[PDB]
PDB file of all heavy atoms in Angstrom:
ATOM      1  N   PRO A   1      14.207  42.712  -3.127  1.00  0.00           N
ATOM      2  CA  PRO A   1      14.148  44.045  -2.518  1.00  0.00           C
ATOM      3  C   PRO A   1      12.707  44.450  -2.252  1.00  0.00           C
ATOM      4  O   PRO A   1      11.836  44.312  -3.113  1.00  0.00           O
ATOM      5  CB  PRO A   1      14.809  44.947  -3.568  1.00  0.00           C
ATOM      6  CG  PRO A   1      15.510  44.014  -4.506  1.00  0.00           C
ATOM      7  CD  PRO A   1      14.748  42.740  -4.490  1.00  0.00           C
ATOM      8  N   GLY A   2      12.461  44.936  -1.038  1.00  0.00           N
ATOM      9  CA  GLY A   2      11.121  45.263  -0.614  1.00  0.00           C
ATOM     10  C   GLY A   2      10.375  44.122   0.035  1.00  0.00           C
ATOM     11  O   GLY A   2       9.258  44.332   0.525  1.00  0.00           O
ATOM     12  N   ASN A   3      10.953  42.922   0.050  1.00  0.00           N
ATOM     13  CA  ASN A   3      10.356  41.747   0.678  1.00  0.00           C
ATOM     14  C   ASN A   3      11.345  41.255   1.726  1.00  0.00           C
ATOM     15  O   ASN A   3      12.338  40.604   1.386  1.00  0.00           O
ATOM     16  CB  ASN A   3      10.062  40.673  -0.359  1.00  0.00           C
ATOM     17  CG  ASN A   3       9.184  39.569   0.176  1.00  0.00           C
ATOM     18  OD1 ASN A   3       9.329  39.142   1.323  1.00  0.00           O
ATOM     19  ND2 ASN A   3       8.264  39.093  -0.658  1.00  0.00           N
ATOM     20  N   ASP A   4      11.093  41.556   2.997  1.00  0.00           N
ATOM     21  CA  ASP A   4      12.064  41.202   4.023  1.00  0.00           C
ATOM     22  C   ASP A   4      11.895  39.789   4.542  1.00  0.00           C
ATOM     23  O   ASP A   4      12.577  39.414   5.499  1.00  0.00           O
ATOM     24  CB  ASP A   4      12.027  42.201   5.187  1.00  0.00           C
ATOM     25  CG  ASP A   4      10.721  42.179   5.964  1.00  0.00           C
ATOM     26  OD1 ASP A   4       9.824  41.354   5.679  1.00  0.00           O
ATOM     27  OD2 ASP A   4      10.598  43.011   6.889  1.00  0.00           O
ATOM     28  N   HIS A   5      11.031  38.984   3.923  1.00  0.00           N
ATOM     29  CA  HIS A   5      10.717  37.659   4.443  1.00  0.00           C
ATOM     30  C   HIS A   5      10.739  36.585   3.357  1.00  0.00           C
ATOM     31  O   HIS A   5      10.171  35.504   3.552  1.00  0.00           O
ATOM     32  CB  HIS A   5       9.348  37.677   5.120  1.00  0.00           C
ATOM     33  CG  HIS A   5       8.282  38.298   4.277  1.00  0.00           C
ATOM     34  ND1 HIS A   5       8.161  39.661   4.114  1.00  0.00           N
ATOM     35  CD2 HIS A   5       7.302  37.739   3.527  1.00  0.00           C
ATOM     36  CE1 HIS A   5       7.144  39.918   3.310  1.00  0.00           C
ATOM     37  NE2 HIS A   5       6.607  38.768   2.939  1.00  0.00           N
ATOM     38  N   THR A   6      11.382  36.847   2.223  1.00  0.00           N
ATOM     39  CA  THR A   6      11.323  35.910   1.109  1.00  0.00           C
ATOM     40  C   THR A   6      12.640  35.927   0.352  1.00  0.00           C
ATOM     41  O   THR A   6      13.273  36.976   0.223  1.00  0.00           O
ATOM     42  CB  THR A   6      10.169  36.251   0.151  1.00  0.00           C
ATOM     43  OG1 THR A   6       8.949  36.405   0.890  1.00  0.00           O
ATOM     44  CG2 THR A   6       9.984  35.158  -0.904  1.00  0.00           C
ATOM     45  N   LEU A   7      13.046  34.755  -0.136  1.00  0.00           N
ATOM     46  CA  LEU A   7      14.162  34.638  -1.064  1.00  0.00           C
ATOM     47  C   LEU A   7      13.721  33.839  -2.285  1.00  0.00           C
ATOM     48  O   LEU A   7      12.851  32.966  -2.200  1.00  0.00           O
ATOM     49  CB  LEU A   7      15.375  33.980  -0.405  1.00  0.00           C
ATOM     50  CG  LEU A   7      16.082  34.798   0.683  1.00  0.00           C
ATOM     51  CD1 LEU A   7      17.144  33.947   1.351  1.00  0.00           C
ATOM     52  CD2 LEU A   7      16.692  36.078   0.114  1.00  0.00           C
ATOM     53  N   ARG A   8      14.320  34.158  -3.426  1.00  0.00           N
ATOM     54  CA  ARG A   8      14.029  33.478  -4.683  1.00  0.00           C
ATOM     55  C   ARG A   8      15.161  32.503  -4.977  1.00  0.00           C
ATOM     56  O   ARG A   8      16.328  32.902  -5.037  1.00  0.00           O
ATOM     57  CB  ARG A   8      13.869  34.488  -5.818  1.00  0.00           C
ATOM     58  CG  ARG A   8      13.740  33.892  -7.209  1.00  0.00           C
ATOM     59  CD  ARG A   8      13.933  34.982  -8.261  1.00  0.00           C
ATOM     60  NE  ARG A   8      13.472  34.580  -9.587  1.00  0.00           N
ATOM     61  CZ  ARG A   8      13.881  35.133 -10.727  1.00  0.00           C
ATOM     62  NH1 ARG A   8      14.779  36.117 -10.717  1.00  0.00           N
ATOM     63  NH2 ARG A   8      13.390  34.698 -11.882  1.00  0.00           N
ATOM     64  N   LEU A   9      14.815  31.229  -5.116  1.00  0.00           N
ATOM     65  CA  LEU A   9      15.748  30.174  -5.484  1.00  0.00           C
ATOM     66  C   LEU A   9      15.524  29.827  -6.950  1.00  0.00           C
ATOM     67  O   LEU A   9      14.382  29.749  -7.400  1.00  0.00           O
ATOM     68  CB  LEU A   9      15.543  28.927  -4.618  1.00  0.00           C
ATOM     69  CG  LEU A   9      16.291  28.820  -3.284  1.00  0.00           C
ATOM     70  CD1 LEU A   9      15.921  29.969  -2.375  1.00  0.00           C
ATOM     71  CD2 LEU A   9      15.983  27.499  -2.583  1.00  0.00           C
ATOM     72  N   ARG A  10      16.618  29.618  -7.684  1.00  0.00           N
ATOM     73  CA  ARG A  10      16.587  29.343  -9.120  1.00  0.00           C
ATOM     74  C   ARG A  10      17.666  28.326  -9.458  1.00  0.00           C
ATOM     75  O   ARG A  10      18.731  28.313  -8.838  1.00  0.00           O
ATOM     76  CB  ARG A  10      16.841  30.605  -9.955  1.00  0.00           C
ATOM     77  CG  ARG A  10      15.651  31.488 -10.174  1.00  0.00           C
ATOM     78  CD  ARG A  10      15.970  32.502 -11.263  1.00  0.00           C
ATOM     79  NE  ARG A  10      17.052  33.402 -10.873  1.00  0.00           N
ATOM     80  CZ  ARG A  10      17.776  34.121 -11.727  1.00  0.00           C
ATOM     81  NH1 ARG A  10      17.542  34.048 -13.031  1.00  0.00           N
ATOM     82  NH2 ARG A  10      18.734  34.919 -11.274  1.00  0.00           N
ATOM     83  N   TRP A  11      17.391  27.476 -10.447  1.00  0.00           N
ATOM     84  CA  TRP A  11      18.373  26.493 -10.884  1.00  0.00           C
ATOM     85  C   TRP A  11      18.056  26.067 -12.311  1.00  0.00           C
ATOM     86  O   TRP A  11      17.005  26.388 -12.869  1.00  0.00           O
ATOM     87  CB  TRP A  11      18.419  25.273  -9.945  1.00  0.00           C
ATOM     88  CG  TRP A  11      17.077  24.595  -9.795  1.00  0.00           C
ATOM     89  CD1 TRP A  11      16.570  23.592 -10.572  1.00  0.00           C
ATOM     90  CD2 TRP A  11      16.078  24.881  -8.805  1.00  0.00           C
ATOM     91  NE1 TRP A  11      15.305  23.253 -10.139  1.00  0.00           N
ATOM     92  CE2 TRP A  11      14.988  24.021  -9.050  1.00  0.00           C
ATOM     93  CE3 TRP A  11      15.999  25.784  -7.743  1.00  0.00           C
ATOM     94  CZ2 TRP A  11      13.826  24.038  -8.267  1.00  0.00           C
ATOM     95  CZ3 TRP A  11      14.842  25.803  -6.962  1.00  0.00           C
ATOM     96  CH2 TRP A  11      13.770  24.935  -7.239  1.00  0.00           C
ATOM     97  N   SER A  12      19.007  25.364 -12.906  1.00  0.00           N
ATOM     98  CA  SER A  12      18.875  24.925 -14.280  1.00  0.00           C
ATOM     99  C   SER A  12      18.182  23.581 -14.329  1.00  0.00           C
ATOM    100  O   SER A  12      18.267  22.787 -13.390  1.00  0.00           O
ATOM    101  CB  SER A  12      20.245  24.815 -14.933  1.00  0.00           C
ATOM    102  OG  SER A  12      20.910  23.696 -14.390  1.00  0.00           O
ATOM    103  N   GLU A  13      17.503  23.326 -15.443  1.00  0.00           N
ATOM    104  CA  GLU A  13      16.990  21.991 -15.688  1.00  0.00           C
ATOM    105  C   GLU A  13      18.141  21.001 -15.613  1.00  0.00           C
ATOM    106  O   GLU A  13      19.271  21.305 -16.014  1.00  0.00           O
ATOM    107  CB  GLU A  13      16.303  21.935 -17.049  1.00  0.00           C
ATOM    108  CG  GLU A  13      15.513  20.674 -17.282  1.00  0.00           C
ATOM    109  CD  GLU A  13      14.660  20.759 -18.530  1.00  0.00           C
ATOM    110  OE1 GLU A  13      14.567  21.854 -19.117  1.00  0.00           O
ATOM    111  OE2 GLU A  13      14.089  19.724 -18.923  1.00  0.00           O
ATOM    112  N   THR A  14      17.860  19.821 -15.073  1.00  0.00           N
ATOM    113  CA  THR A  14      18.898  18.891 -14.655  1.00  0.00           C
ATOM    114  C   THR A  14      18.665  17.526 -15.285  1.00  0.00           C
ATOM    115  O   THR A  14      17.562  16.982 -15.196  1.00  0.00           O
ATOM    116  CB  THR A  14      18.906  18.810 -13.130  1.00  0.00           C
ATOM    117  OG1 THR A  14      19.116  20.127 -12.601  1.00  0.00           O
ATOM    118  CG2 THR A  14      20.000  17.905 -12.638  1.00  0.00           C
ATOM    119  N   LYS A  15      19.704  16.974 -15.910  1.00  0.00           N
ATOM    120  CA  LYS A  15      19.585  15.675 -16.568  1.00  0.00           C
ATOM    121  C   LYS A  15      19.156  14.595 -15.580  1.00  0.00           C
ATOM    122  O   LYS A  15      19.736  14.459 -14.501  1.00  0.00           O
ATOM    123  CB  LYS A  15      20.914  15.277 -17.210  1.00  0.00           C
ATOM    124  CG  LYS A  15      20.836  13.972 -17.990  1.00  0.00           C
ATOM    125  CD  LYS A  15      22.221  13.457 -18.387  1.00  0.00           C
ATOM    126  CE  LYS A  15      22.371  11.977 -18.033  1.00  0.00           C
ATOM    127  NZ  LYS A  15      21.580  11.121 -18.958  1.00  0.00           N
ATOM    128  N   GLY A  16      18.139  13.827 -15.959  1.00  0.00           N
ATOM    129  CA  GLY A  16      17.688  12.712 -15.153  1.00  0.00           C
ATOM    130  C   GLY A  16      16.738  13.070 -14.031  1.00  0.00           C
ATOM    131  O   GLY A  16      16.227  12.161 -13.368  1.00  0.00           O
ATOM    132  N   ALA A  17      16.470  14.358 -13.808  1.00  0.00           N
ATOM    133  CA  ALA A  17      15.680  14.776 -12.659  1.00  0.00           C
ATOM    134  C   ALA A  17      14.197  14.589 -12.931  1.00  0.00           C
ATOM    135  O   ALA A  17      13.703  14.953 -14.001  1.00  0.00           O
ATOM    136  CB  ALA A  17      15.961  16.239 -12.314  1.00  0.00           C
ATOM    137  N   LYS A  18      13.490  14.016 -11.958  1.00  0.00           N
ATOM    138  CA  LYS A  18      12.035  14.067 -11.923  1.00  0.00           C
ATOM    139  C   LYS A  18      11.522  15.201 -11.048  1.00  0.00           C
ATOM    140  O   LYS A  18      10.474  15.777 -11.341  1.00  0.00           O
ATOM    141  CB  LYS A  18      11.464  12.737 -11.410  1.00  0.00           C
ATOM    142  CG  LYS A  18      11.827  11.530 -12.265  1.00  0.00           C
ATOM    143  CD  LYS A  18      11.294  11.688 -13.668  1.00  0.00           C
ATOM    144  CE  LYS A  18      10.756  10.371 -14.200  1.00  0.00           C
ATOM    145  NZ  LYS A  18      11.858   9.382 -14.349  1.00  0.00           N
ATOM    146  N   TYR A  19      12.238  15.529  -9.982  1.00  0.00           N
ATOM    147  CA  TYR A  19      11.890  16.672  -9.155  1.00  0.00           C
ATOM    148  C   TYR A  19      13.115  17.076  -8.355  1.00  0.00           C
ATOM    149  O   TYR A  19      14.192  16.485  -8.480  1.00  0.00           O
ATOM    150  CB  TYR A  19      10.689  16.373  -8.253  1.00  0.00           C
ATOM    151  CG  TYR A  19      10.903  15.269  -7.251  1.00  0.00           C
ATOM    152  CD1 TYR A  19      11.341  15.549  -5.966  1.00  0.00           C
ATOM    153  CD2 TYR A  19      10.639  13.944  -7.579  1.00  0.00           C
ATOM    154  CE1 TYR A  19      11.536  14.542  -5.048  1.00  0.00           C
ATOM    155  CE2 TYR A  19      10.820  12.933  -6.665  1.00  0.00           C
ATOM    156  CZ  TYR A  19      11.266  13.239  -5.395  1.00  0.00           C
ATOM    157  OH  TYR A  19      11.446  12.234  -4.465  1.00  0.00           O
ATOM    158  N   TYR A  20      12.943  18.129  -7.559  1.00  0.00           N
ATOM    159  CA  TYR A  20      14.017  18.712  -6.774  1.00  0.00           C
ATOM    160  C   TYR A  20      13.557  18.871  -5.332  1.00  0.00           C
ATOM    161  O   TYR A  20      12.380  19.131  -5.067  1.00  0.00           O
ATOM    162  CB  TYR A  20      14.439  20.077  -7.349  1.00  0.00           C
ATOM    163  CG  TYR A  20      14.769  20.020  -8.822  1.00  0.00           C
ATOM    164  CD1 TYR A  20      13.778  20.201  -9.788  1.00  0.00           C
ATOM    165  CD2 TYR A  20      16.069  19.777  -9.250  1.00  0.00           C
ATOM    166  CE1 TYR A  20      14.075  20.151 -11.155  1.00  0.00           C
ATOM    167  CE2 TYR A  20      16.372  19.727 -10.607  1.00  0.00           C
ATOM    168  CZ  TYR A  20      15.379  19.908 -11.550  1.00  0.00           C
ATOM    169  OH  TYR A  20      15.693  19.850 -12.895  1.00  0.00           O
ATOM    170  N   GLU A  21      14.499  18.726  -4.407  1.00  0.00           N
ATOM    171  CA  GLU A  21      14.261  18.968  -2.992  1.00  0.00           C
ATOM    172  C   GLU A  21      15.134  20.119  -2.531  1.00  0.00           C
ATOM    173  O   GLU A  21      16.286  20.243  -2.957  1.00  0.00           O
ATOM    174  CB  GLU A  21      14.549  17.729  -2.146  1.00  0.00           C
ATOM    175  CG  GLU A  21      13.746  16.528  -2.587  1.00  0.00           C
ATOM    176  CD  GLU A  21      14.026  15.297  -1.753  1.00  0.00           C
ATOM    177  OE1 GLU A  21      14.981  15.310  -0.954  1.00  0.00           O
ATOM    178  OE2 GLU A  21      13.283  14.316  -1.899  1.00  0.00           O
ATOM    179  N   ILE A  22      14.566  20.952  -1.660  1.00  0.00           N
ATOM    180  CA  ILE A  22      15.198  22.165  -1.153  1.00  0.00           C
ATOM    181  C   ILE A  22      15.267  22.070   0.362  1.00  0.00           C
ATOM    182  O   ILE A  22      14.258  21.781   1.012  1.00  0.00           O
ATOM    183  CB  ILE A  22      14.409  23.419  -1.555  1.00  0.00           C
ATOM    184  CG1 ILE A  22      14.463  23.642  -3.073  1.00  0.00           C
ATOM    185  CG2 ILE A  22      14.933  24.638  -0.809  1.00  0.00           C
ATOM    186  CD1 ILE A  22      13.364  24.577  -3.514  1.00  0.00           C
ATOM    187  N   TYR A  23      16.438  22.368   0.924  1.00  0.00           N
ATOM    188  CA  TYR A  23      16.641  22.337   2.363  1.00  0.00           C
ATOM    189  C   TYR A  23      17.292  23.626   2.826  1.00  0.00           C
ATOM    190  O   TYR A  23      18.100  24.219   2.110  1.00  0.00           O
ATOM    191  CB  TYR A  23      17.514  21.163   2.784  1.00  0.00           C
ATOM    192  CG  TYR A  23      16.916  19.838   2.388  1.00  0.00           C
ATOM    193  CD1 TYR A  23      17.031  19.362   1.086  1.00  0.00           C
ATOM    194  CD2 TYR A  23      16.223  19.069   3.312  1.00  0.00           C
ATOM    195  CE1 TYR A  23      16.469  18.155   0.712  1.00  0.00           C
ATOM    196  CE2 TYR A  23      15.654  17.853   2.949  1.00  0.00           C
ATOM    197  CZ  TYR A  23      15.785  17.401   1.651  1.00  0.00           C
ATOM    198  OH  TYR A  23      15.227  16.196   1.288  1.00  0.00           O
ATOM    199  N   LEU A  24      16.915  24.054   4.027  1.00  0.00           N
ATOM    200  CA  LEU A  24      17.573  25.162   4.710  1.00  0.00           C
ATOM    201  C   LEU A  24      18.728  24.604   5.531  1.00  0.00           C
ATOM    202  O   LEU A  24      18.517  23.727   6.377  1.00  0.00           O
ATOM    203  CB  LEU A  24      16.586  25.905   5.612  1.00  0.00           C
ATOM    204  CG  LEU A  24      17.230  26.959   6.519  1.00  0.00           C
ATOM    205  CD1 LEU A  24      17.972  28.002   5.669  1.00  0.00           C
ATOM    206  CD2 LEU A  24      16.200  27.627   7.412  1.00  0.00           C
ATOM    207  N   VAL A  25      19.938  25.100   5.279  1.00  0.00           N
ATOM    208  CA  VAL A  25      21.132  24.673   6.002  1.00  0.00           C
ATOM    209  C   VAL A  25      21.364  25.627   7.167  1.00  0.00           C
ATOM    210  O   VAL A  25      21.621  26.817   6.960  1.00  0.00           O
ATOM    211  CB  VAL A  25      22.358  24.643   5.078  1.00  0.00           C
ATOM    212  CG1 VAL A  25      23.593  24.218   5.860  1.00  0.00           C
ATOM    213  CG2 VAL A  25      22.104  23.732   3.881  1.00  0.00           C
ATOM    214  N   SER A  26      21.299  25.106   8.391  1.00  0.00           N
ATOM    215  CA  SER A  26      21.452  25.916   9.596  1.00  0.00           C
ATOM    216  C   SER A  26      22.378  25.203  10.571  1.00  0.00           C
ATOM    217  O   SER A  26      22.042  24.125  11.069  1.00  0.00           O
ATOM    218  CB  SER A  26      20.095  26.190  10.252  1.00  0.00           C
ATOM    219  N   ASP A  27      23.531  25.813  10.853  1.00  0.00           N
ATOM    220  CA  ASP A  27      24.513  25.260  11.788  1.00  0.00           C
ATOM    221  C   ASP A  27      24.842  23.808  11.442  1.00  0.00           C
ATOM    222  O   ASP A  27      24.826  22.915  12.294  1.00  0.00           O
ATOM    223  CB  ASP A  27      24.023  25.384  13.232  1.00  0.00           C
ATOM    224  N   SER A  28      25.114  23.577  10.155  1.00  0.00           N
ATOM    225  CA  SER A  28      25.503  22.261   9.637  1.00  0.00           C
ATOM    226  C   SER A  28      24.416  21.199   9.836  1.00  0.00           C
ATOM    227  O   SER A  28      24.722  20.020  10.027  1.00  0.00           O
ATOM    228  CB  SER A  28      26.826  21.789  10.250  1.00  0.00           C
ATOM    229  N   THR A  29      23.143  21.587   9.789  1.00  0.00           N
ATOM    230  CA  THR A  29      22.055  20.627   9.633  1.00  0.00           C
ATOM    231  C   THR A  29      21.090  21.143   8.574  1.00  0.00           C
ATOM    232  O   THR A  29      20.974  22.352   8.356  1.00  0.00           O
ATOM    233  CB  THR A  29      21.295  20.358  10.949  1.00  0.00           C
ATOM    234  OG1 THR A  29      20.386  19.269  10.751  1.00  0.00           O
ATOM    235  CG2 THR A  29      20.487  21.564  11.381  1.00  0.00           C
ATOM    236  N   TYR A  30      20.407  20.215   7.907  1.00  0.00           N
ATOM    237  CA  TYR A  30      19.483  20.532   6.823  1.00  0.00           C
ATOM    238  C   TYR A  30      18.043  20.384   7.294  1.00  0.00           C
ATOM    239  O   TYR A  30      17.686  19.367   7.894  1.00  0.00           O
ATOM    240  CB  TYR A  30      19.699  19.621   5.614  1.00  0.00           C
ATOM    241  CG  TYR A  30      21.114  19.496   5.115  1.00  0.00           C
ATOM    242  CD1 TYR A  30      22.012  18.629   5.725  1.00  0.00           C
ATOM    243  CD2 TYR A  30      21.544  20.211   4.004  1.00  0.00           C
ATOM    244  CE1 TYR A  30      23.306  18.497   5.259  1.00  0.00           C
ATOM    245  CE2 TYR A  30      22.842  20.086   3.527  1.00  0.00           C
ATOM    246  CZ  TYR A  30      23.716  19.229   4.160  1.00  0.00           C
ATOM    247  OH  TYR A  30      25.006  19.094   3.695  1.00  0.00           O
ATOM    248  N   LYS A  31      17.215  21.379   6.990  1.00  0.00           N
ATOM    249  CA  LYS A  31      15.799  21.354   7.330  1.00  0.00           C
ATOM    250  C   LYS A  31      14.980  21.384   6.050  1.00  0.00           C
ATOM    251  O   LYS A  31      15.192  22.255   5.200  1.00  0.00           O
ATOM    252  CB  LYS A  31      15.424  22.532   8.216  1.00  0.00           C
ATOM    253  CG  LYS A  31      13.944  22.743   8.326  1.00  0.00           C
ATOM    254  CD  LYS A  31      13.537  23.109   9.742  1.00  0.00           C
ATOM    255  CE  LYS A  31      12.024  23.300   9.840  1.00  0.00           C
ATOM    256  NZ  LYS A  31      11.324  21.992   9.949  1.00  0.00           N
ATOM    257  N   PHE A  32      14.044  20.446   5.921  1.00  0.00           N
ATOM    258  CA  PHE A  32      13.288  20.327   4.681  1.00  0.00           C
ATOM    259  C   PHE A  32      12.413  21.553   4.451  1.00  0.00           C
ATOM    260  O   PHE A  32      11.684  21.989   5.348  1.00  0.00           O
ATOM    261  CB  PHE A  32      12.421  19.073   4.699  1.00  0.00           C
ATOM    262  CG  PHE A  32      11.451  19.013   3.567  1.00  0.00           C
ATOM    263  CD1 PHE A  32      11.845  18.544   2.335  1.00  0.00           C
ATOM    264  CD2 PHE A  32      10.144  19.448   3.727  1.00  0.00           C
ATOM    265  CE1 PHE A  32      10.960  18.502   1.288  1.00  0.00           C
ATOM    266  CE2 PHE A  32       9.254  19.409   2.673  1.00  0.00           C
ATOM    267  CZ  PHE A  32       9.661  18.923   1.461  1.00  0.00           C
ATOM    268  N   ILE A  33      12.450  22.087   3.234  1.00  0.00           N
ATOM    269  CA  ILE A  33      11.608  23.209   2.843  1.00  0.00           C
ATOM    270  C   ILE A  33      10.490  22.775   1.903  1.00  0.00           C
ATOM    271  O   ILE A  33       9.315  23.035   2.166  1.00  0.00           O
ATOM    272  CB  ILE A  33      12.449  24.342   2.214  1.00  0.00           C
ATOM    273  CG1 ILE A  33      13.465  24.857   3.227  1.00  0.00           C
ATOM    274  CG2 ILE A  33      11.534  25.452   1.740  1.00  0.00           C
ATOM    275  CD1 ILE A  33      14.199  26.069   2.742  1.00  0.00           C
ATOM    276  N   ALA A  34      10.835  22.112   0.797  1.00  0.00           N
ATOM    277  CA  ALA A  34       9.841  21.841  -0.235  1.00  0.00           C
ATOM    278  C   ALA A  34      10.403  20.895  -1.281  1.00  0.00           C
ATOM    279  O   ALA A  34      11.612  20.836  -1.497  1.00  0.00           O
ATOM    280  CB  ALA A  34       9.375  23.133  -0.915  1.00  0.00           C
ATOM    281  N   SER A  35       9.502  20.170  -1.933  1.00  0.00           N
ATOM    282  CA  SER A  35       9.801  19.404  -3.131  1.00  0.00           C
ATOM    283  C   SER A  35       9.039  20.026  -4.294  1.00  0.00           C
ATOM    284  O   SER A  35       7.865  20.376  -4.150  1.00  0.00           O
ATOM    285  CB  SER A  35       9.394  17.933  -2.956  1.00  0.00           C
ATOM    286  OG  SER A  35      10.190  17.302  -1.964  1.00  0.00           O
ATOM    287  N   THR A  36       9.695  20.156  -5.449  1.00  0.00           N
ATOM    288  CA  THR A  36       9.060  20.820  -6.581  1.00  0.00           C
ATOM    289  C   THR A  36       9.599  20.261  -7.889  1.00  0.00           C
ATOM    290  O   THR A  36      10.743  19.798  -7.963  1.00  0.00           O
ATOM    291  CB  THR A  36       9.272  22.339  -6.536  1.00  0.00           C
ATOM    292  OG1 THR A  36       8.550  22.959  -7.604  1.00  0.00           O
ATOM    293  CG2 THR A  36      10.764  22.702  -6.638  1.00  0.00           C
ATOM    294  N   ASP A  37       8.751  20.277  -8.916  1.00  0.00           N
ATOM    295  CA  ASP A  37       9.224  20.023 -10.270  1.00  0.00           C
ATOM    296  C   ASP A  37       9.436  21.311 -11.062  1.00  0.00           C
ATOM    297  O   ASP A  37       9.701  21.253 -12.267  1.00  0.00           O
ATOM    298  CB  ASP A  37       8.274  19.072 -11.012  1.00  0.00           C
ATOM    299  CG  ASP A  37       6.875  19.633 -11.180  1.00  0.00           C
ATOM    300  OD1 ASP A  37       6.683  20.859 -11.100  1.00  0.00           O
ATOM    301  OD2 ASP A  37       5.948  18.831 -11.405  1.00  0.00           O
TER     302      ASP A  37
END
């Protein structure tokens, strides 16, 4: 709220994970956003 250009993504620690990849899903295609640990 108060930020019209940002969303906060959150998830749980995941067994076996070294890092995570995030994609924007638009009209049934995925666009790469970021890789993060």
